[PDB]
Design a protein around this ligand. Structure first.
Ligand SMILES: Nc1ncnc2c1ncn2[C@@H]1O[C@H](COP(=O)(O)OP(=O)(O)OP(=O)(O)O)[C@@H](O)[C@H]1O
Ligand SMILES: Nc1ncnc2c1ncn2[C@@H]1O[C@H](COP(=O)(O)OP(=O)(O)OP(=O)(O)O)[C@@H](O)[C@H]1O
Ligand SMILES: [Mg+2]
Ligand SMILES: [Mg+2]
Lengths: 403, 297, 587, 404
């Protein structure tokens, strides 16, 4: 009925736990081994889960921590400290957050501490502790990298079992760390490159749309799963998936496409079709700057054609309003499109407002609003395509632009 | 040559020795007329050829005996209007606290001294147009202090194009009376033989000059300058524009808006930390890359 | 004790405990100065109030109509007046002060004014604005402005006056307009711009997408030259104020005004400095006040003051007249001298009043004549006739010959103006001309009627427009120190360096110059400047050092070290710059 | 409140919102042009559906503290005082503390952020923090962004959680005529006002496609359009005579009231008295500035210096206007000033105060950001006819001396 909407909206909108991994089994076996070694035995480990954006890092660490925390022995003892690099941008905020996460707001009686090191040592003093330093590459931008130095230094066998799990998107995170924290770092890394060929991607597509086995009505479920099996083995759906595979390869963009297909199944239309996936692919793949030049009026289109004619002579030397207006006045002489300078200036400001033209000076004051050196931000082929899709371009303007 | 040798080798005897003494004895007559016109609202600027330091130091010992006065030496390289306003706040009014901005410290020092008009103060600026006290901001601060009824200012200018500093609003604020005093005393105190091609600098570019001017800077400004150092060290294998640098500060969590970065850059321009080699603009540091890598300890 | 690694020192008197002393009959000469100067200041600000009322009426009408539009509505386009003040920045503030009063009488209690220097960003702008609104009746936001307005009127518009329009940052101004346009139903805002040059600054400072949110109507302020003409008709060309200005000092002040900067306030500064220098010197200026009380002060004098009277040049030329009997009586007897000075001071006062009343009628004649060969303003006519005999010149002959061709139709209105100016001030000692103008006016062949009134005005201008130097005791109320005044007001520092290096003989007078000046010239700087002069934008330190040493000696260690001092000193004064050296700025 | 020509966008948005207890996209990025109903359709749709929402304008919130406190306080008025947070970490905790109320705990709480492009110039952590807020707080929250800028410019350098970008396409000519002709004045026919909008869009569409500006010009010129019908000159039926009247008046209105040289109120007050054209000068054509004598000569010397090449100085006194002004040092200004004026000039302090006073106004501009006091560099920033008028006033011929 509408339970399909609830379940698949929890699958795609937010990242809810779903049953099966996709080609990252070795990385999960490694990381589960590290965390079980830290949780049961007295070992301290540092890892860095390096991967592209939207390639399974947060999912894998949450799944590993859940599967570990199912054990009754670990659950009564272990403490989890979640830190996010976006939220905590100072040493004060980070240390206050660690204190609040460990629920030690009554062990400390607001006693000032000499250093961050002594404060962190006293908090760890007063039971293994697991850290998860999400957005790790933002923690590197601290003025003096005290948080990483102290965490890594304590993880060098200070008789407190601590696992520091960094999650970063940058593929050169190791070259940002300063010499100290790099030297304290235990050189163990887990890559998560989203490497799978196209048939595996099609198998992922046909499995995500499938419902779980548990559903209060099963006869609708088996029909829907048979429908998904039909959609997977169809040419036009495979053309859409081959077009989306060549760009992203990550499951988040596929989730967005699947949601836009899913959204338009009504009570009148209870089954998916290939037309839904084609129009969802059309919604995902729109070009932005072509839409912007689609919006523009005729007078601003004539200005853009004059800027293109200036770039095809001066070869990317910058321009001002006077040269553009001079070229446009060369066009309008040899009557319908004759306008005075303030109307053309009112048109020229609106291009700067849309960011199609940017000034190359970054002025502190003002430079007369004409005689200001500027740059177009479109290629020539973008302009030609955009004029091709323009609704009703007047014939003389098109003949001027083409020649 | 050496700076120590030149300071020891000044055993010269000027040719006109009595006529210069007669000249400097004529300007001691005018002091009473200068004391009248300060009390009526005017302010006095002294321009000439010699060094007016001795004349103003004769003025202070002759006239300003029973009055509070602040003696400001413009020639000392480590000075700004922040130092002067801190001096008046801590050592005259005795607030001895902390203010968020220098503009608000100006408003506090202006709403006191207006409440009690019995309190009086003199300023004696030995050189008003030295490199630190130039600029629209510093002259605006000094002009707003000078235009009150309880603060009197007397100054001396040396540079050739000095009246280019003040416009019609600043000339309204200061209200000058221009008095010419052309002594011939040498600038033995004013000039220091540094950045001079002929004499050795006792180290042309020591890192101590960088370290001392970075001790006055706020720590976040030290970070905004430290990032520029790190970007400088990797183009030694063959200029940074404002846009790229503003981006690099923005993801380093050091500036909010570009105006804060620009105002911070003016401080480095005054301290000579940065020189903008405009091509489209670019930013560069004059201190050499080897010495710059020798700064990171 | 004044030189240390500390930047600046604070010297107080520790455990320690007037103006007339610096002036040092200095006391009574100082009281007269304070009296006259506060009267001139009060009359200037009263004139400032009365001058600009005509535009304040239109501005108050525009604000009442605009807030009536808000009373219709509660879409709205932020009512704005682009008030075009002049380039004379120095005297804008008084105008805004007057305007801040005028609106506050009629339109609204809530008027605030913002200087551009106090608001670099949008936080400081709102902090200053909310502080001034809370003042007249902790992290402030725009919603706080609307909450304050809703609480305090538990009706009138809130008006802000942007003082100097050029020097706001662009971003603060656009953000304020965009934010304020959304909340016009809660916060009724009226903007007034202090435009200084031209309305086009709005287009330079606001794009078309923000200025379309404003409805702007232009206004004016009165031009500078009529404000100067009004303060000179009242503060100088009158007899209510005793102190007067010599013609050459007037030329100095109206050449600082007309060439360098339009500013009435600078002209008033010049009059204050003239008054102070006239009262500081001339101890006989004790007799410069309201003529009645001056005669009281004449009796209570000393012998030395009578000696100063006797030594005065104009009184010396007066006692040269009738040398036989009254001369020895005045030189021997102090009492006869005292009474004679009373008589001469009375004659000076009546000379002044007759002179100004004749001068206004001569101006009423020249006003009609469009050629204006003697000047269109009253002040330049006063300046051109004050030093030179007006009748003796060819200039008056030219204006007379152009005057004869005038017909009766304009000329009856001219005698109407002359009768008006005679009627405006009573108690004149000019009764005969006052009743002759009346008979010439209102007559019921025209040419013989016109020739007599022209010869009549010639008789008046010859009789009473004599220059003030041809009067006894003019020196007591006249100030002629134009050169020292000019060097105080406009001093050129870079012409007093060029005559202290090239010509050191002017200050050191010990035969140190012949025209090559001399080898034993003023210490170490003039040789460096003279040898520096010869290049073409190219100086080598080694060659310049050799050229210096080949003339100073006519050991080498002290010669070269003195050259180090000379090069560093000309670098301090800014003549040369580091870069062998190869720069000469003064080229 | 009616929504016309926007059926498809409303259908997509209403379907994406779903039922109340269901989840939705973490963030949506609506973009488009200047008047495409970005604010109108979103506010109307959210208000009619009766969903809880918080409408926040970013141009008002110029500080982190103001934006975060404004969102928190508008959420706290919807629960069933004056909570203050100064950091974004405090905002996440207080948002998890506020939304636990029973009104908001099941539904989808919407936070609309109008004018999102100013959010680009605030703190760096703010925009990826809002794009991921449903993950950070775990509280069923959706954050719309309404902007004019494409999403390409918004991307941070590392990357962020991608929002579903939605495009609001512009009104065409038929859509514009359907929007404008809806709220016809009731005294006249609907067809009459439709024909009026047709003759308006015939002459104003090539210049302007903005709905607000065209609507304001359809409000101003309408009483002049129905002037022949009230004086019995032509009936309501005959559109051709009415169009023949209204075409020259609209062509006059394009030059003056459209550019706001003539204000709207003054345009109405002229048009009621049949005196609109050429009677008011406007904000332009007031290029007359009353200057002192040496300010006039300094200003024309700076202009004549800044638009000549330095090679020709001996040829005149003793690459075009297209490129613009070229900066010059102080020394060349003083040399041309002494050569150009017949009277002998001393270099008094007031002349240097004048040179920096024109810089204090916007008649010159100092380009040198080096040591300003030793050799400043200046640049002239006034147009050609302003200098030609000044040179007319002091009777100097500026045209002969210019190189071009
Ligand atoms: N290798 C994989 N196996 C199974 N699911 C995956 C895999 N990669 C991505 N996904 C799915 O794609 C979505 C990616 O979201 P996820 O929370 O993993 O992003 P992330 O990369 O961990 O976080 P961020 O992008 O902020 O660094 C999740 O729903 C996850 O289930
Ligand atoms: N589809 C429509 N139907 C009816 N009226 C509309 C429509 N679109 C816009 N309008 C009218 O246009 C006016 C302005 O629209 P709106 O301000 O929402 O545009 P916008 O694109 O949000 O502007 P901005 O981009 O400046 O926020 C509204 O008052 C509304 O009445
Ligand atoms: Mg993640
Ligand atoms: Mg918007």
């Amino acid at each position: 009925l509408s339970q399909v909407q609830r379940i698949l909206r929890e699958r795609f909108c937010r990242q809810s736990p779903h049953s099966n991994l996709f080609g990252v089994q070795v990385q999960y076996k490694h990381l589960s081994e590290l965390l079980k070694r830290t949780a049961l035995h007295g070992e301290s480990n540092s890892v860095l889960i390096i991967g592209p954006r939207g390639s399974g890092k947060t999912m894998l660490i949450n799944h590993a921590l859940k599967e570990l925390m199912e054990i009754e022995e670990v659950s009564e003892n272990v403490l989890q400290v979640h830190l996010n690099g976006l939220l905590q941008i100072n040493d004060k905020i980070a240390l206050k957050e660690i204190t609040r996460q460990l629920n030690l707001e009554n062990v400390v009686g607001d006693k000032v501490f000499g250093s961050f090191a002594e404060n962190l040592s006293f908090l760890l003093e007063a039971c293994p502790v697991i850290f998860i330093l999400d957005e790790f590459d933002l923690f590197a931008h601290h003025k003096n990298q005290t948080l990483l130095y102290n965490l890594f230094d304590i993880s060098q066998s200070a008789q407190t079992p601590i696992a520091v799990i960094g999650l970063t998107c940058r593929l050169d995170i190791l070259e940002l760390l300063e010499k100290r924290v790099k030297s304290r770092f235990s050189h163990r890394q887990i890559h998560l490159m989203n490497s799978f060929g196209f048939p595996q991607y099609v198998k992922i597509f046909k499995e995500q749309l499938s419902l779980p086995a548990e559903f209060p009505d099963k006869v609708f479920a088996e029909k829907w799963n048979e429908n998904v099996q039909y959609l997977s083995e169809d040419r036009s759906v495979q053309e859409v998936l081959q077009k989306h595979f060549n760009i992203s390869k990550n499951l988040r963009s596929l989730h967005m496409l699947l949601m836009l297909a899913l959204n338009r199944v009504t009570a009148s239309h209870p089954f998916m079709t290939a037309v839904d996936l084609m129009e969802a692919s059309q919604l995902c793949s729109m070009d932005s700057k072509a839409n912007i030049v689609h919006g523009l009026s005729v007078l601003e289109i004539c200005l853009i054609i004059a800027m293109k004619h200036l770039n095809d002579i001066y070869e990317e030397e910058p321009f001002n309003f006077q040269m553009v207006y001079n070229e446009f006045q060369k066009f309008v002489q040899r009557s319908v499109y004759n306008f005075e300078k303030p109307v053309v200036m009112k048109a020229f400001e609106h291009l700067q407002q849309l960011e199609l033209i940017k000034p190359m000076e970054r002025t502190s004051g003002n430079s007369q609003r004409e005689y200001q050196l500027m740059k177009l931000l479109l290629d020539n082929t973008q302009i030609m395509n955009a004029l091709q899709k323009y609704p009703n371009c007047p014939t003389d303007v098109r003949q001027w632009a083409t020649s | 040559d050496q700076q120590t040798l030149r300071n020891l080798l000044s055993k010269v005897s000027p040719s006109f020795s009595a006529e210069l003494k007669q000249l400097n004895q004529q300007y001691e007559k005018l002091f009473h007329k200068w004391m009248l016109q300060l009390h009526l609202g005017f302010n006095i600027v002294l321009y000439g050829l010699g060094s007016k330091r001795d004349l103003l130091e004769r003025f202070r010992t002759t006239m300003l005996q029973d009055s509070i006065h602040v003696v400001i030496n413009g020639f000392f390289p480590g000075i700004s209007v922040k130092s002067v306003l801190n001096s008046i706040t801590e050592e005259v009014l005795d607030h001895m606290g902390t203010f968020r901005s220098i503009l608000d410290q100006l408003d506090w020092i202006v709403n006191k001294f207006k409440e009690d008009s019995s309190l009086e103060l003199f300023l004696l600026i030995h050189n008003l147009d030295s490199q630190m006290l130039r600029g629209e901001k510093s002259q605006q601060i000094i002009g707003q202090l000078s235009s009150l009824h309880n603060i009197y200012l007397i100054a001396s200018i040396d540079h050739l194009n000095a009246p280019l500093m003040w416009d019609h609003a600043k000339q309204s604020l200061f209200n000058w009376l221009w008095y010419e005093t052309t002594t011939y005393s040498p600038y033995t105190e004013e000039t220091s033989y540094e950045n001079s091609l002929l004499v050795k600098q006792s180290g042309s570019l020591p890192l101590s000059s960088l370290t001392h001017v970075l001790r006055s800077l706020t720590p976040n400004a030290r970070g905004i300058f430290r990032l520029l150092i790190k970007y400088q060290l990797d183009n030694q294998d063959n200029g940074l524009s404002f846009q790229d640098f503003y981006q690099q500060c923005r993801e380093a969590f050091l500036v909010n808006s570009d105006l804060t970065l620009r105002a911070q850059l003016t401080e480095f321009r005054d301290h000579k930390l940065i020189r903008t080699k405009k091509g489209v603009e670019y930013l560069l540091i004059p201190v050499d890359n080897g010495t710059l890598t020798d700064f990171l300890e | 004790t004044s030189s240390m690694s500390k930047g600046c020192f604070v010297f107080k008197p520790n455990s320690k405990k007037p103006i007339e002393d610096y002036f040092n009959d200095s006391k009574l000469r100082f009281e007269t100065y304070q009296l006259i100067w506060q009267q001139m200041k009060s009359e200037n600000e009263r004139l400032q109030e009365e001058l600009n009322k005509n535009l304040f009426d239109n501005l108050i009408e525009f604000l009442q109509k605009s807030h009536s539009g808000f009373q219709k509505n509660s879409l709205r386009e932020i009512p704005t007046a682009a008030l075009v003040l002049g380039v004379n920045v120095t005297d804008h503030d008084l105008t805004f002060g007057s305007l801040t009063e005028a609106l506050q009488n009629n339109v609204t209690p809530y008027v605030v004014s913002l200087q551009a220097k106090d608001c670099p960003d949008m936080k400081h702008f709102l902090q200053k604005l909310i502080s001034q609104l809370m003042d007249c009746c902790t992290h402030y936001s725009m919603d706080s402005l609307s909450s304050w307005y809703m609480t305090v009127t538990q009706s009138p518009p809130v008006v802000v006056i942007l003082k100097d329009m050029e020097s706001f940052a662009t971003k603060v101004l656009q953000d304020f307009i965009i934010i304020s346009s959304q909340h016009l139903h809660e916060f009724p805002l009226i903007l007034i711009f202090g435009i200084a040059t031209s309305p086009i600054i709005i287009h330079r400072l606001l794009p078309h997408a923000v200025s379309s949110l404003l409805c702007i109507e232009l206004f004016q302020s009165l031009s500078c030259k009529e404000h100067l003409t009004t303060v000179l008709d009242k503060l100088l060309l009158t007899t209510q104020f005793p102190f007067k200005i010599n013609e050459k000092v007037l030329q100095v002040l109206t050449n600082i005004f007309l060439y360098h900067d339009f500013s009435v306030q600078n002209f008033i500064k010049g009059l204050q400095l003239s008054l102070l220098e006239h009262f500081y010197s001339q101890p006989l200026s004790v007799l410069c006040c309201n003529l009645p009380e001056a005669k009281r002060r004449i009796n209570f004098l000393s012998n030395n003051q009578c000696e100063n009277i006797r030594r005065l040049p104009s009184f010396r030329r007066y006692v040269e007249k009738q040398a036989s009997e009254k001369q020895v009586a005045l030189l021997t007897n102090e009492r006869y001298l005292k009474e004679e000075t009373q008589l001469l001071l009375e004659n000076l006062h009546v000379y002044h009043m007759n002179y100004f009343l004749v001068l206004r009628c001569l101006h009423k004649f020249t006003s009609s004549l469009p050629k204006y060969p003697l000047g269109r303003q009253i002040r330049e006519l006063y300046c051109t006739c004050l030093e030179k005999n007006i009748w003796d010149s060819e200039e008056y002959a030219s204006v007379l010959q152009l005057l004869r061709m005038l017909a009766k139709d304009e000329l009856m209105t001219i005698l109407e103006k002359c009768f008006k100016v005679f009627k405006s001030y009573c108690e004149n000692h000019l009764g005969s001309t006052a009743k002759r103008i009346e008979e010439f006016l209102a007559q019921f062949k025209f040419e013989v009627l016109r020739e007599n009134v022209v010869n009549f005005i010639d008789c008046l201008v010859r009789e009473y427009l004599l220059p003030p130097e041809t009067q006894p005791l003019h020196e007591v109320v006249y100030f002629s120190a134009a050169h020292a005044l000019r060097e105080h007001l406009n001093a050129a520092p870079r012409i007093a360096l060029h005559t202290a290096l090239n010509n050191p003989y002017y200050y050191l007078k010990n035969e140190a110059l012949k025209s090559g000046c001399i080898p034993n010239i003023a210490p170490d700087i003039c040789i460096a400047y003279k040898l520096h002069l010869e290049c073409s934008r190219l100086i080598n330190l080694v060659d310049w050092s050799e050229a210096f040493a080949t003339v100073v000696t006519a050991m080498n260690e002290i010669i070269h070290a003195r050259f180090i001092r000379a090069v560093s000193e000309l670098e301090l004064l800014g003549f040369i710059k580091p870069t062998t050296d190869h720069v000469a700025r003064l080229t | 409140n009616v929504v016309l020509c926007r059926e498809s966008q409303v259908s997509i948005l209403q379907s994406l919102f779903g039922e109340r207890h269901h989840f939705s996209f973490p963030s949506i990025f609506i973009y488009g042009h200047t008047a495409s109903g970005k604010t109108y359709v979103t506010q109307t749709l959210l208000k009619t559906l009766e969903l809880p929402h918080v409408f926040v304008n970013c141009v008002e919130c110029f500080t982190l503290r103001l934006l975060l406190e404004q969102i928190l306080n508008k959420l706290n008025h919807l629960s069933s005082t004056e909570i203050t947070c100064e950091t974004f970490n405090d905002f996440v905790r207080l948002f998890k503390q506020v939304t636990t109320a029973e009104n908001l705990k099941d539904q989808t709480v919407y936070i609309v952020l109008d004018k999102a492009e100013y959010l680009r110039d605030m703190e760096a952590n703010l925009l990826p923090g809002f794009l991921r807020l449903q993950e950070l707080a775990d509280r069923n929250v959706t954050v719309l962004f309404l902007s004019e800028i494409v999403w390409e410019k918004f991307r941070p350098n590392t990357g962020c959680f991608e929002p579903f970008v939605l495009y609001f396409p512009d009104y065409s000519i038929g859509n514009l005529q359907k929007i404008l002709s809806h709220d016809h004045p009731p005294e006249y026919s609907a067809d009459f006002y439709a024909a009026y909008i047709n003759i308006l869009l015939g002459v104003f569409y090539t210049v302007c496609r903005d709905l607000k500006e065209l609507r304001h010009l359809a409000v101003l010129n309408f009483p002049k359009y129905c002037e022949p019908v009230v004086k019995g000159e032509a009936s309501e039926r005959d559109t051709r005579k009415l169009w023949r009247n209204i075409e020259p008046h609209l062509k006059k209105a394009m030059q003056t009231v459209y550019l706001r040289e003539i204000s709207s109120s003054q345009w109405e007050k002229l048009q009621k008295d049949d005196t609109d054209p050429g009677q008011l000068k406007g904000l332009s054509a007031h290029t007359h500035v009353e200057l002192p004598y040496y300010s006039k000569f300094i200003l024309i010397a700076a202009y004549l210096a800044s638009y000549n090449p330095a090679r020709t100085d001996k040829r005149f006194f003793l690459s075009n206007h297209l490129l613009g002004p070229k900066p010059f040092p102080l020394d060349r200004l003083l040399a041309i000033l002494y050569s150009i004026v017949d009277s002998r000039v001393a270099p008094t302090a007031n002349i240097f105060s004048q040179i920096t006073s024109l810089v204090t106004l916007q008649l010159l501009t100092l380009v040198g950001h080096d040591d300003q006091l030793d050799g400043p560099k200046y640049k002239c920033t006034v147009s050609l006819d302003f200098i030609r008028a000044i040179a007319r006033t002091v009777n100097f011929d500026i045209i002969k001396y210019l190189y071009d």
